[PDB]
Design a protein around this ligand. Structure first.
Ligand SMILES: *[C@H](c1c(-c2ccc(Oc3ccccc3)cc2)c2c(N)ncnc2n1CCOC)[C@@H](C#N)C(=O)NC(C)C
Length: 261
């Protein structure tokens, strides 16, 4: 037999070309002719179904409101995989976007709360991401973020995981902590002035990103404890889901608005 995730090929319609790469093709499209959908294609001369449909299981296992819902699949090559179309694209581009201009701190932390969300659910289902960054975090109507790419970016990576490959969810927090600078300085490269070797050399030797211009020292504290040396005394994604979600009641009920944030 086959699983429920499967459907026919005539119902699908690809209607906009969203990307191009060494990986497959990002397309918008229509399923059943009256449902907006995001599609990614894979090649049958640069990969195999089993080899890349291992990323599908892990997707098909996980189903949460802040991870990009894998609606459906086409298993026999060619292999269209199908997904909720988040409209506003990646978060990095939405923040260097026109919008990211007027975007203020209440939405920069709320989105960041929405993702602390998603990374809690992974965290409870005992998975790691390996890669977490603004360049990965999706977004849709009314700023609805989601994380994605589940199953080199050394600027977002915990030292244990750059050097040894201790990719454990206290690497994905460090990243989240780097993610946390991006929202709060609009997609401006983590670690300004600096390049992948200078990073480590310094990172280790103690150095951590100073609080951004105009950014509350509490969030810098949240940042600076996602970047603690010993992985496991970083905070959990649930602790973080909470701290961010109740931030303006419980933490900063002292902030009036500013010149960027
Ligand atoms: C293309 C893209 C996607 C998108 C769709 C499916 C995947 O598949 C996948 C497989 C395994 C694990 C995680 C994810 C990835 C990305 C997408 C969606 N879903 N909705 C809207 N836009 C989307 N884009 C890009 C922005 O389009 C507005 C991306 C990929 N891969 C991509 O091209 N982004 C970067 C340039 C890499």
């Amino acid at each position: 037999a086959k699983d429920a995730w499967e459907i026919p090929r005539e119902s699908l319609r690809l209607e906009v070309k969203l990307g191009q790469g060494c990986f497959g093709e990002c397309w918008m499209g229509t399923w059943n002719g009256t449902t907006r959908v995001a599609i990614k294609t894979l090649k049958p001369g640069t990969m195999s179904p089993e080899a890349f449909l291992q990323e599908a299981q892990v997707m098909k296992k996980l189903r949460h409101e802040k991870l990009v819902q894998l609606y459906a699949v086409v298993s026999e090559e060619p292999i269209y995989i199908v997904t909720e179309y988040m409209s506003k694209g990646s978060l990095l581009d939405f923040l260097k976007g026109e919008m990211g201009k007027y975007l203020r701190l209440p939405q920069l932390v709320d989105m960041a709360a929405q993702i602390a969300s998603g990374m809690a659910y992974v965290e409870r289902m005992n998975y790691v991401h390996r890669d977490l960054r603004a360049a990965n975090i999706l977004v849709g109507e009314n700023l609805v973020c989601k994380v994605a790419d589940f199953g080199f970016p050394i600027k977002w990576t915990a030292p244990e995981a750059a050097l040894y490959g201790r990719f454990t969810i206290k690497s994905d927090v460090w990243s989240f902590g780097i993610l946390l600078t991006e929202l709060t300085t609009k997609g401006r490269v983590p670690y300004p002035g600096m390049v992948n070797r200078e990073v480590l050399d310094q990172v280790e030797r103690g150095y951590r990103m100073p609080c951004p211009p105009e950014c509350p020292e509490s969030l810098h504290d949240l940042m600076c404890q996602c970047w603690r040396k010993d992985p496991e005394e970083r905070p959990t994604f649930e602790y973080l889901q909470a701290f961010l979600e109740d931030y303006f009641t419980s933490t900063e009920p002292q902030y009036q608005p500013g010149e960027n944030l």
